């Protein structure tokens, strides 16, 4: 009389065991939720960024509470000229109209595993800075100008050290996809 | 009379999954390398696969893998894990493939969370994300 | 609960000794 319902099936799900004891405690997994970008590999480890920060600080003979000014202009330079320059080169930062020059050897040499991954820690601030300077005049980083990025709004996702997190727009992800043009 | 009764699970006799005898060796070997006693290592292995979900399962031997306590990162050497994994790390880590999809789906119901194996390959889907690790 | 951190190791570093006394003043 009562319609014959299908006996629901239950997919057993195989725990990885070791000598009769499981290797995972589940009360911790149902509570362990780390940020994706913190455990990622595209971003250099926090221990590997502090080493690069102090090493460059020692190389420039610039004390604390003053270096943030230097790092304030490092990423702006790195936005325009990528993050894989020649070691023997030099990078520039402006005071008014006068250019000041800092050697590029300590930055690239002391960056492990690479400069791009070390510089990815600024990827959250770079888009905020590009958008801030894009509301008054068009301002496109050279990473887009070389590859013919024919868009105005999609410019804050157009630097070399941008990290593709889970929350980037799909258009940004494809905009990174073509790469060399 | 034995064949009409012998029905093993496909994934147990498979070759993509490392042998149970070859997983216990990798488990004890890594346990000896980290000097971490039992009833405590499950916590370490609780974060090993989460790291391996994001960054694949073929990293550099001389590298290091990270696991978070609150906001502070802790680092474990990657040499014992890759070196002592036979025949390879992917097949040894495949034993967690049943738990990985359950974990990814658990962390996908509150915010979008896609492992980097999909982000690099442009996996343009939301529901099909729990099948997107190495 | 607290993640099980790896016990840092300390590489002992062998001073050149002579009859129970070191030959270098550091």
Residue numbers in the entry:
A (entry chain Aa): 42 to 222
B (entry chain Ah): 68 to 201
C (entry chain Ar): 42 to 67
Excerpt from the paper describing this PDB structure:
A comprehensive analysis of the cryo-EM data revealed two new filament architectures in addition to the predominant RNA-free stacked ring assembly (VLPr) that we had previously observed. In the absence of RNA in VLPr and VLPh, the C-IDR in CPr and CPh is disordered, with no traceable cryo-EM density beyond A222. In all three structures, there was no cryo-EM density for the first 41 residues of N-IDR, exposed on the outer surface of the filaments. In the absence of ssRNA, the N-IDRs adopt two slightly different conformations, as seen in CPr and CPh allowing the formation of two different types of RNA-free filaments, with the stacked octameric ring assembly being the more stable and therefore predominant form. The RNA-free filaments with stacked-ring architecture are predominant and thus represent the most stable form of CP self-assembly. In wild type VLPr filaments, the N-IDR is responsible for the axial connection of the octameric rings, with no obvious interactions between the core regions of the CPs. In RNA-free VLPs composed of wild type CP, each CP subunit is linked to four adjacent subunits, with N-IDRs acting as clutches.
Potyviral CP plays a role in virtually every step of the viral infection cycle, from transmission of the virion by aphids, virus assembly and disassembly, regulation of genome amplification, protein translation, to cell-to-cell and long-distance movement. CP consists of a highly conserved globular core flanked by two large extended regions with a high frequency of structural disorder. The C-terminal high intrinsic disorder region (C-IDR) is partially conserved and packaged in the lumen of the virion, supported by the helical ssRNA scaffold. Here, we show that we can control the shape, size, RNA encapsidation ability, symmetry, stability and surface functionalization of nanoparticles through structure-based design of CP from potato virus Y (PVY).
